[PDB]
Paper text:
ABCB6 is a “half-transporter” that contains a single pair of TMD and NBD, but needs to form a homodimer to be functional. ABCB6 is a porphyrin transporter located in the outer membrane of mitochondria that may regulate the heme biosynthetic pathway together with the plasma membrane porphyrin transporter ABCG216,17. ABCB6 plays a crucial role in energy-dependent porphyrin transport, drug resistance, toxic metal resistance, porphyrin biosynthesis, protection against stress, and encoding a blood group system Langereis antigen.
Furthermore, we solved the nucleotide-bound structure of human hABCB6[EQ] at 3.5-Å resolution by using cryo-EM, allowing for unambiguous side-chain placement for most of the protein. The nucleotide-bound hABCB6[EQ] forms an occluded conformation compared with the apo-state inward-facing conformation. The remarkable change between nucleotide-bound state and apo-state is the closure of opposing NBDs triggered by the binding of ATP and Mg2+. The closure of the two NBDs leads to an anticlockwise rotation of TM4 and 5, which is a common feature of conformational change within ABC transporters. In the lipid bilayer, the closure of the two NBDs also triggers the rotation of the plug to eliminate the barrier for substrate translocation and the TMDs adopt a collapsed conformation without substrate binding. In the nucleotide-bound structure, the “plug” swinging to TM6 belongs to the same monomer to form an open state and clears a pathway toward the outside, accompanied by the conformational change of the two W546 residues and forming π–π interaction to further constitute a “bottom” of the cavity 2. In this process, the “H–P” cavity 1 disappears and cavity 2 is decreased to extrude substrates. The structure indicates that cavity 2 of hABCB6 is not suitable for the accommodation of substrates in this state and substrates escaped from this cavity before the hydrolysis of ATP.
Numbering used by the authors:
A (entry chain B), B (entry chain A): 238 to 827
The structure:
C-alpha cells in the first residue's frame, strides 16, 4: 500500500496541467517563474541582513547606510515571511492561479457528475444518498486542495532546503551543509516511521465515519415515516450513541497527530542546537565573524519556518485524502450494461416486439423470469396480469434495457436490442413508472421534460389528454406552480396524471404502462383510456394493471404467476377456458 | 449589518465554554494558562537572542557562552515560530483542546439534528434535500472551525501586539511604541474599509451558490426519470452552463482577496521601513547599541509573522461564515404546529372521532375543506370516496395533526386534539401512508419500527396478517434482506404489505388507511381485509379507497367532491337514493 501511494500522487498530478487551452498553458509557465523567483529571495534576504549589521559595526556614513536598509525592506516586502505565506510575489501568483484551478475544479466536477448518470440501474438502487452526494460535493475540493499544497507548499519547501544545502557548502564550509542535511534526513525518516504507525488509526476511521451518518441521513430522506410513528426521540438517541463511538475513535486519530507534531519539533530543535553551538564555536575560535552568526541565525529560522506552519494542516491533509480516495474508488466502477463497440442505431420501422425464451436473475439465487416468450404485432395492446411479485414490471425493465439478460433474445423489428446502441433504443420507447417521481420545479417543466424542445402550446394540448388540464386552472399561479421535492405537494392522483402527460409529449413508438390507474378513481380511467386509444391507434402498447376491467378490450392477455406464463390469449378465450384467469375474474365480480 | 455582526461573534462565543461538566471546565482554565505562557516566550526569545550576540561582541569565554546559547534553543523549542504555528507548548494545548471541541461538535450536531425533526410537515415538503443535508453537514465544522481561529489565532495575535506596545515603550523609548501602534492602527482601518467594499461580491455569491447545485442534486435524487427519457446529456449541459455563471462570479470574490492581501502587505512593509530606518539612525547617532538593532530586527518579524500566515486563510474564513450563517438562519425557524403550555396527555378511552364544521386551507388561496362534519362511533369503519384531488387524504392529515385548522373543532373521545400534547395524540393513531417509504436496512427492522421493543416472534406473527409472510421465505437471506433506499429493491406490492405490517405491530386505538390495496391485486385484498377485520374488531377505522368493492360492508360511506360532503350513509341507502354515489357505482359495473 506504500507503492500504490506513489501512483496516488502521480494520478493526482495529471490534474495540474491544463489540456487543450494554450491560453492557460502559459499562465502555468510563468507561475513557475514567480515560484523560481521567490527561491532567490530566500537567499538574498538574509545576505542583505548581515550587510546592514556589518555597516553598523564598521560605522558607515548615513548616506551610504540608508540605501541598503531600504534595500532590505524592499526584498522583505517581496518575500512576506517565507514560502507558504503571502508576500507580494507569493500572492501575485495566487492572483493568476485562481483562473487555472477554475479549469481543474470545473473539469473534475463535470467528470464525477457525468459518471454518476452513466452508471447502470443496479448501482443506483444499492447506493446511499448521504454517501454519494457527499463524495460528489467534497470531491472537487480535495483535488483542488491537495494541488494547492503539493505545488505551493511541499515542493517549494523541498526546493528551499536543497538550495540551503548548496548554500552553506560552497560559501561557508563543509560543516553547515552537513548539519542542515543530517537534520532534514532525520526529519524525513521520523515522519515516515510515525506515519506507518499512524495508519492503524486513520484507515479504521473512514470505514466508521460513513457508518455513523448513514442512519441519520436515512432518517431524514423519509421525514414522514419518522413523523407518523411516535419518534423524533428514538432517532436522536441512536445518533448520540453512534457519535460517541466515532468521537471516541477520532480522539485516537487527532491525538496521534500531536505525537507526530512533537517528534518533528524535537528534530528541528536538535539541528538548531547543533548548528547554533557550532557557529558560536567558530566565532570564539575566530574562524568566522560575528556578522556571519547573524546570517546563520536568521536563515535557519526561515528554513525551519514552513516546516512548523505545515504542522497546522495535518488534520485537513487527512480529510483531503479521505475525500479524494473515496472519489477514485467511485470512478473505477464500470457500467454494468455496456453497448457494443461498432454499434449502429436502432432502425425503428413498425414496432414488433418479440421475446424468445428469455431467462433472467437479479442476484443468481432465484430465476425471476423463466422461459418468457411472446410476440406483439404492431398496433396492438398486450396485457400482463398476475399477483404481486410475479415479474410483471421486470419485463418492462428488460425491454427498456436497464439489465442484461442471461440467455434468450429480445427483438424489436427483427433487431436485437443488445446489438444496437442503448441511447437509440430508449428513444422509441416511452414508459410511465409505477410510482412516479417529479423534479423540484414548475409542473409545466415536468410535463415538457419528455420532449424538451416543445412549446407551451403543445404542453397544454397533451395535458388535455391526461385529464389534468381542468384541474390546474383551478390552482393559483397557473402552470408554473410548485410540486415540492418529488411531487409531494400535489396529490396521489395529480402526481400521476403528470406522468401520463409527459409520455405523450415524447410520442414514442412503443408505449409502456407499469401503473397508470392506481391512484385514479373509476371515472378517470376511461377519460384517459379512450383518450390514449386515439394516441395508441397505430403504436405498440404494453399495459399491466391489477384491476381487470381495463384489459377487457386488449388484444392479448398474458398471465404471470411466478415468472412463468401459465396461459395466454384474448379475454373471451380465457373465460371459457376456466383457468386461473377465469377464477381471477369471478373473484372480483363477487 | 455591521452592528449585527457584533452578535454573530457574541453568539458564537457561547459555544466556547463547556456547560454542566466541570471536568472539562478546568481544561479550558489551563489551556488559558498555556496560552498566557506562550505570550511570555514571545518576549523572552529575542531578548536571549541579543544576549548571544553581545557575548560574541564582547568575546565571552566558551564556558559561559554555551550555557546561554542552549538557553536560546530551548525557548525556541517551546515557541516553534510564533503563535499560530506548532511549538512544544502550542501543540500541548492542542492535545488538550481536542477533548473540548468534541463536546462542542457533539452538542451542536445533536442540536441541528433534533431541530430538523421537530419542524412541522409544511417545511419538509418545501425544502430541498441538497441544501438541507449540506448545512447539517457543514454546520458543525464552521463553529468548530471559527472557534479554533478566534481563540487560537485572532486573540493571541492581538494579545501579542499589545504586549509589543508596552514593550518598546518602557524599555527603549517613546518612539517604537508609536511606530508599531501607528502601523497596526493603519492595518485595522484598511482591513475594514476593504471588507466593506468586498461585501458587494461575497453576499451575491451565497444566493447563487445554492442555485447552481439545486438542479444537479435534484437531477440525482430521482435517477430513474433521467434514465427513462433520453437524457444524461441534457442534465450535464445545464450543469456546465450553471457552473460558468458561478465560476465567473467567484473569480470576482477570490481575486478580491488578493487586493485585500496586497493592501495589508503594503502596510506591514511601511511600518518595517519606518522602524528599520529609525533604529539605524539611533545607532548612527549612538543612542543605542548594534546589539539593540538585532533585538529589533528579530522581534518585528515575529510580530508581523502571524499577520501574513493568516492571509492564507481568508477563503476558508469566508466559507466558514457562509456555512455558519445558513445554520443560524435555519435555527430561527419555529415549529408551525405548537402544543399549548400546560398541556396534558390525551386520555384515550373508546375512540370516538368527531369533526364540527372544520375549515382548512393550505396557502389561503383556496379553501380545501369546507364544512366537513361527521361522527364515528367506536368500533365502526368509515369510508371516504370521491374523485382525485377532493380532499380525502387531507382529512387524514388533520386527524393526525400535521396541520392546524382555521376554524371548527376536532374531538377524540370528547377531547380537543389542539389542547392535548401532540406526542400523545399520535400514539393512539396508526396510519399507513399512500405511497410507502422504507428505511435503507433490513425488512425485519422496517416491520418492527412500529413498536421497537417487540421481539422477533411478534414481528413474524403480525407479518402473517399482512400476507407477506409466505413471500419472504421464498427470498434468500430470510427476514434481514435489503430493500435498498426507500424500498425500491422489493416491488410495488411487496413494498406496500410491509407498511400494513408495521401498523399492526403498533396496534393503535385508531387505524387510518390512505391507500392499502392500490398495488395489490384483487386476490390479496380480502386475504388482508378479512385479516384486518379481526384486528379492527373493536378499534376505530377510517378507510379511503378508489376501488369501490372494498367499502361495501362499511358502516358509513362519505362522498367528497371538492372538499364538501354531498351525501352520506350506508351502501344500500345511497344506491336507492340515486345520487352521485349510485352513478359512480353503475359506472364501474359496466
Ligand atoms: N431491484 C431488485 N433487486 C432484487 N430483487 C428484485 C428487484 N426488483 C424486483 N425484485 C424481485 O423480483 C420479483 C418481481 O417483482 P416485480 O418488481 O416484478 O413486481 P411485479 O411482478 O411487477 O408486481 P407488482 O408490480 O404488483 O409489484 C419480486 O418478488 C422481487 O423480490
Ligand atoms: N402539501 C400541499 N400543498 C399545497 N396544496 C396541496 C398539498 N397537498 C394537497 N394539496 C391540494 O389539496 C387538494 C387535495 O389533495 P389530496 O392530497 O387530498 O388528494 P385526495 O383528495 O386525497 O385524492 P387522492 O388521494 O386520490 O390524491 C389537491 O387538489 C391539492 O392541489
Ligand atoms: Mg410494478
Ligand atoms: Mg391520497
Amino acid at each position: 500500500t506504500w507503492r500504490d501511494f506513489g501512483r496516488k500522487l502521480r494520478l493526482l498530478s495529471g490534474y495540474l496541467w491544463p489540456r487543450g487551452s494554450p491560453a492557460l498553458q502559459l499562465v502555468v509557465l510563468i507561475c513557475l517563474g514567480l515560484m523560481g523567483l521567490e527561491r532567490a529571495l530566500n537567499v538574498l534576504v538574509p545576505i542583505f541582513y548581515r550587510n546592514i549589521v556589518n555597516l553598523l559595526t564598521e560605522k558607515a556614513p548615513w548616506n551610504s547606510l540608508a540605501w541598503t536598509v531600504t534595500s532590505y525592506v524592499f526584498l522583505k516586502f517581496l518575500q512576506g515571511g517565507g514560502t507558504g505565506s503571502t508576500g507580494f510575489v507569493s500572492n501575485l501568483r495566487t492572483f493568476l492561479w485562481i483562473r487555472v484551478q477554475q479549469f481543474t475544479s470545473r473539469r473534475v466536477e463535470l467528470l464525477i457528475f457525468s459518471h454518476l448518470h452513466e452508471l447502470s440501474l443496479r448501482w443506483h438502487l444499492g447506493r446511499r444518498t448521504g454517501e454519494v452526494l457527499r463524495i460528489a460535493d467534497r470531491g472537487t475540493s480535495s483535488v483542488t486542495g491537495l494541488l494547492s499544497y503539493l505545488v505551493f507548499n511541499v515542493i517549494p519547501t523541498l526546493a528551499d532546503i536543497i538550495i540551503g544545502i548548496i548554500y552553506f557548502s560552497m560559501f561557508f564550509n563543509a560543516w553547515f551543509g552537513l548539519i542542515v542535511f543530517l537534520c532534514m534526513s532525520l526529519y524525513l525518516t521520523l515522519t515516515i516511521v510515525v506515519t506507518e504507525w499512524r495508519t492503524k488509526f486513520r484507515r479504521a476511521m473512514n470505514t466508521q465515519e460513513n457508518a455513523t451518518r448513514a442512519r441519520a441521513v436515512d432518517s431524514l430522506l423519509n421525514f414522514e415515516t419518522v413523523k407518523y410513528y411516535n419518534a423524533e426521540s428514538y432517532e436522536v438517541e441512536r445518533y448520540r450513541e453512534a457519535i460517541i463511538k466515532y468521537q471516541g475513535l477520532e480522539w485516537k486519530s487527532s491525538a496521534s497527530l500531536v505525537l507526530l507534531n512533537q517528534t518533528q519539533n524535537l528534530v528541528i530543535g536538535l539541528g538548531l542546537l547543533a548548528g547554533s553551538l557550532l557557529c558560536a564555536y567558530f566565532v570564539t575560535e575566530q574562524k568566522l565573524q560575528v556578522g556571519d552568526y547573524v546570517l546563520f541565525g536568521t536563515y535557519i529560522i526561515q528554513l525551519y519556518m514552513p516546516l512548523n506552519w505545515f504542522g497546522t494542516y495535518y488534520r485537513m491533509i487527512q480529510t483531503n485524502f479521505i475525500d479524494m480516495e473515496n472519489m477514485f474508488d467511485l470512478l473505477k466502477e464500470e457500467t454494468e450494461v455496456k453497448d457494443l463497440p461498432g454499434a449502429g442505431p436502432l432502425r425503428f420501422q413498425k414496432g414488433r416486439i418479440e421475446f424468445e425464451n428469455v431467462h433472467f436473475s437479479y442476484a443468481d439465487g432465484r430465476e425471476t423470469l423463466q422461459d418468457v416468450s411472446f410476440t406483439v404485432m404492431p398496433g396492438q395492446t398486450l396485457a400482463l396480469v398476475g399477483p404481486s411479485g410475479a415479474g410483471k414490471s421486470t419485463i418492462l425493465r428488460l425491454l427498456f434495457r436497464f439489465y442484461d439478460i442471461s440467455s434468450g433474445c429480445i427483438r424489436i423489428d427483427g433487431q436485437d436490442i443488445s446489438q444496437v446502441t442503448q441511447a437509440s433504443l430508449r428513444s422509441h420507447i416511452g414508459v410511465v413508472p409505477q410510482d412516479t417521481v417529479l423534479f423540484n420545479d414548475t409542473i409545466a417543466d415536468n410535463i415538457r421534460y419528455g420532449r424538451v424542445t416543445a412549446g407551451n402550446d403543445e404542453v397544454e394540448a397533451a395535458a388535455q389528454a391526461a385529464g389534468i388540464h381542468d384541474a390546474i386552472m383551478a390552482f393559483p399561479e397557473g402552470y408554473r406552480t410548485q410540486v415540492g421535492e418529488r411531487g409531494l405537494k400535489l396529490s396521489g392522483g395529480e402526481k400521476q396524471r403528470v406522468a401520463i402527460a409527459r409520455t405523450i409529449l415524447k410520442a414514442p413508438g412503443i408505449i409502456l404502462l407499469d401503473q397508470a390507474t392506481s391512484a385514479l378513481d373509476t371515472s378517470n380511467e376511461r377519460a384517459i383510456q379512450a383518450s390514449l386509444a386515439k394516441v395508441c391507434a397505430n403504436r405498440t402498447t404494453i399495459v399491466v394493471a391489477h384491476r381487470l376491467s381495463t384489459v377487457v378490450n386488449a388484444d392479448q392477455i398474458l398471465v404471470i404467476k411466478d415468472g412463468c406464463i401459465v396461459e395466454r390469449g384474448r379475454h373471451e378465450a380465457l373465460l371459457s377456458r376456466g383457468g386461473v384467469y377465469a377464477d381471477m375474474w369471478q373473484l372480483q365480480q363477487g
